[PDB]
Design a protein around this ligand. Structure first.
Ligand SMILES: *[C@@H]1O[C@H](CO)[C@@H](O[C@@H]2O[C@H](CO)[C@@H](O)[C@H](O)[C@H]2NC(C)=O)[C@H](O)[C@H]1NC(C)=O
Lengths: 50, 50
């Protein structure tokens, strides 16, 4: 069964990880990316997944 | 010397500073619970990456 579902997300300081309404911790800063030193942010994930 | 005056002594009420006081801080209240659900979740969701 394919499921697409919209959820809320909550991160506390230092914001190097967050949660979801279902209760799943995503181990990556909500601001990690590619633009303007965003690769400085934290992601314990293999860079190919993002 | 004798005096026809009647004495009266008035001293101003001195200043007094009120320092902030708390019986319990909210961190102690958060620690009152035997199991903080969030911290348990964050620890237990690191098993594969650990
Ligand atoms: C006028 O003000 C007070 C009484 O309200 C007296 O001042 C204090 O007196 C005590 C002894 O009773 C001393 O230990 C203190 O040093 C005094 N000052 C303060 C700020 O407490 C004072 O003696 C009174 N005047 C007279 C003539 O007795």
């Amino acid at each position: 069964n394919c499921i697409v579902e919209e959820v809320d997300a909550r991160s506390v300081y230092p914001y190097d990880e967050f949660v979801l309404a279902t209760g799943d911790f995503v181990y990556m800063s909500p601001f990690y990316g590619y633009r303007e030193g965003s690769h400085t942010e934290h992601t314990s994930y293999a860079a190919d997944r993002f | 010397t004798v005096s026809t005056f009647i004495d009266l002594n008035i001293t101003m009420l001195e200043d007094h500073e009120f320092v902030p006081l708390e019986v319990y801080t909210r961190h102690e209240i958060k620690d009152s619970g035997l199991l903080d659900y969030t911290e348990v979740q964050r620890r237990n969701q690191l098993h594969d990456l650990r």
